[PDB]
Each structure stands twice: as structure tokens, then as C-alpha cells.
Design a protein around this ligand. Sequence first.
Ligand SMILES: NC(=O)c1ccc[n+]([C@@H]2O[C@H](COP(=O)([O-])OP(=O)(O)OC[C@H]3O[C@@H](n4cnc5c(N)ncnc54)[C@H](OP(=O)(O)O)[C@@H]3O)[C@@H](O)[C@H]2O)c1
Lengths: 319, 112
Amino acid sequence: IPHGKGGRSSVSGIVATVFGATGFLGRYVVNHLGRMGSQVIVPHRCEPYDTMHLRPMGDLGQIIFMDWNGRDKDSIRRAVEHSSVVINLVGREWETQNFDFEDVFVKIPQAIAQVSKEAGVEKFIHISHLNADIKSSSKYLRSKAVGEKEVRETFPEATIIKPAEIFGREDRFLNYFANIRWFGGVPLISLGKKTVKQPVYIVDVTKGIINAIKDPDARGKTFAFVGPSRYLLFDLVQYVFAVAHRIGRLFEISPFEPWTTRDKVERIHTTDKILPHLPGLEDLGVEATPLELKAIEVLRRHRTYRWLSSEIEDVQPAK
Amino acid sequence: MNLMLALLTNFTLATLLVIIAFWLPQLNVYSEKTSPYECGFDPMGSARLPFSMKFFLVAITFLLFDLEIALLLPLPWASQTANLNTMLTMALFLIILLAVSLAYEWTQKGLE
Ligand SMILES: NC(=O)c1ccc[n+]([C@@H]2O[C@H](COP(=O)([O-])OP(=O)(O)OC[C@H]3O[C@@H](n4cnc5c(N)ncnc54)[C@H](OP(=O)(O)O)[C@@H]3O)[C@@H](O)[C@H]2O)c1
């Protein structure tokens, strides 16, 4: 039950449990739950120090930390016992040299679709992507579609979310570009055919959740997040170099956290603008943010003062 | 032929240790907030570098006292010599010729 103003130090009824919550997507969620105030039980894998910038979000006794491996059952059956909602965003990029990567999107969202489901939770939420299609792409992009399909068997009403591609503040998607101060700028693959996707702004995706977390009546009704205005061009890569003007890893360096001479060069250019009958963002209101307002901020190289911004795009066509 | 391999050892050991500190163990692609910070423990300095007169005369004055020590430099080689009344009375000239250049400037230095 709620009480008083929801500024800080209130009760607000909900008791979430947000798995992951260290990466760019999982962290920025917990910031908006350390405002309205709630028992946001965040468990973390193996990181004592790398989670320290998360503590001045929970007021005093709001958040709480636990350690958990993920494959073992009861390590994820001990935190899910006292909860109201539980959302999932676990996962990564490329296959690691210890794990198997196949069932990690199958058994592990099912390992927390175990007695977690039975114990009395509600509003269990998973994530998707706008390009995860069971047609022959990719090793990561499909086998996420296994997680769309093989985990849908349990919890027949979830509101699994299907956000668009994200541009943000500390992300990897747009930041994979303009970090290519290198012996050449090679696009994918010297072509501007299907560029670009829908770069939704990360504040909207973390505002969609917290409007769905007490919506009500949003269970089973999966959602797909609208992007900015409107499609975009290959001019994006030219626009990135327009204004730019050309955790827990190791002690010295981690010798393998690469740029992946594999599927990753084409894990983003397979676009597949999916079904526009999905409800999917504006009805999960209210949020609609462009790119050309929030583009100055995260792009940051050695000029640092002089921008003189005028670069834009028409729509582009098929708008 | 080691003079010249007496120093190219010393500089390739020098440039070795800097790139195994500036490069290698470094690469800060994580959070690495290089935002507007790093401004040398301050903020934005909208002023440029202003001229300071009392810190220009210190440059020129040294340069004109630096020349005639190189004239004064071959005094130990001017010992094992011929006619030495010339050698003594000319060696005393340059020092006084350096000394007067003090005393004229010494009546106006400024807060140096
Ligand atoms: N919606 C989108 O547009 C989009 C884009 C890219 C990726 N994704 C996927 O959607 C989620 C977004 O995550 P993100 O953007 O914050 O990047 P992220 O680096 O994948 O962060 C997610 C967290 O999951 C952790 N993790 C990886 N393997 C794990 C395992 N076996 N067990 C427990 N934790 C594990 C990661 O490292 P730790 O174990 O150290 O915590 C990380 O902290 C991820 O699942 C991601 O693969 C979505």
C-alpha cells in the first residue's frame, strides 16, 4: 500500500526483484525505483566493487544485495520468495570461454521461471528485441528467439517487452561507432541500404517499465517500442562523425573483451521493422523522444567546446 | 663504435617503459567518463595567456650574459701559451665588460 509523496523515503507498495542490473540497461532502471522508493532486491553475480555506484539510490534499507550463480536452483529461489513483481534482463553479447550460450537464453530464464512461478509472484517480465527472428539469423539474434518461444511455455501471461534499438549515455550500440579511430572507416558493408533502425532513447524504455509495473491489466499483452522521428539513413554514420569532428574485468587488462570478428558486424544490420499492430509504446504512455535533441550529449571527443550544430535528416523516405 | 649504442639502448629502454604504462595496461573503454572534467583541477578558463613584461626581460638578459662566457670558456686553454701580458690583460677585459652591463641595468631591474 502507498503513503505520502513519492519523492523519496515513501513506501509505494511494490517490492521488485531486478536481476542483472549492472549493465547499461539494468542499472538505469533501478535509478527510477530508488526515487519512488521500494524494496528493490537486486542480486548480483560476482561483483563486490563494481556495484558500489548503485548504493546512493536506495534510501536506507530500500535495496539489498545477494550473490547467486544462476544455474543453481535455490540461489535464485531464495530471493524470489518475498516479492510482488520480478523483471528479467539477464544475458550478454558473445559466447564466453566458460559458458555454452545456447540454453543461457533457454534454461536460465526458465531457471527463474521455476518455483519462482509457483511461490506466488505476479507480473513476471522478460525482454525481447525488434530483430530476434527465427529465420536464419543470427547465432545471438536467433537463440534469443528460442527465449521468445521456449520460455513462453511457462508463464502464459507475462508482458514480455520488445524494445527497439537503444541509444543512451553509457551504451555500446552507438558507441561501437565513433570508437573507430582506426586505419579506416569501413561501413557495413560499404552500403546504405537498410540503415537505419529505430534508436529509442533509454529514458523512454526505463519509463515504459515503471508505467507498466503498476499499469494494471498488462499481462500477456506484449509491447514493442516506437523509435524516434522517423526511420533514419546511412547519414547516421556521417551524422555521428558530424558533431564528433572525427566492469569487473581484470587488474591490468582483460585480454578478451573484443569487437568480435564474427556475427557482430551483422548482428545490427538485419533490421526487420516488425509488426506495427503491436500496441506498443505510446499506449504504454507517455513517451516520444527524438534523436536530434539528445545527440549532442553522449558523443564527446577532443573538441569539447565548439559544435556549431546544423546537421539533420529529412525523414527519411518510407516514413 | 659504441656511443651510438651507448645511448640508443638508453632511449629504447626509456620508450619501452612508457608504452607499457600509457598503452597496454590502460585502454579505458568502460565507463571512463571523459566528460568536461579533467580540466586541470578547475573549470573553464575563458581568458587566454596574458603578456607579463617582468617575465620577458628575464629571458633576454640571460641570453646576453650567456654569450660571453663562451668567449670566457677557453681560459684554461689560454694558459700554456706565448706572450702572457696580453693574455692576462685581455682576460680581465671581458669580465669587466660583463660587469658594466650589470651596473647599468642594475639601476632598473623591476620585480623580476
Ligand atoms: N533491448 C536491447 O536493445 C538489447 C541490446 C543489447 C543486448 N540486450 C540484451 O538485454 C539485456 C540488456 O543488458 P545490458 O544492455 O545492460 O548489457 P549487459 O552487459 O549484457 O548487462 C546485463 C548483465 O547480465 C550479466 N550477465 C552475463 N551473463 C550472466 C550470467 N550467466 N549470469 C548472470 N549474469 C550475467 C552481465 O554481467 P555480470 O554477470 O557481471 O552481471 C551484465 O551485468 C541483456 O540480456 C542483453 O544481452 C538487449
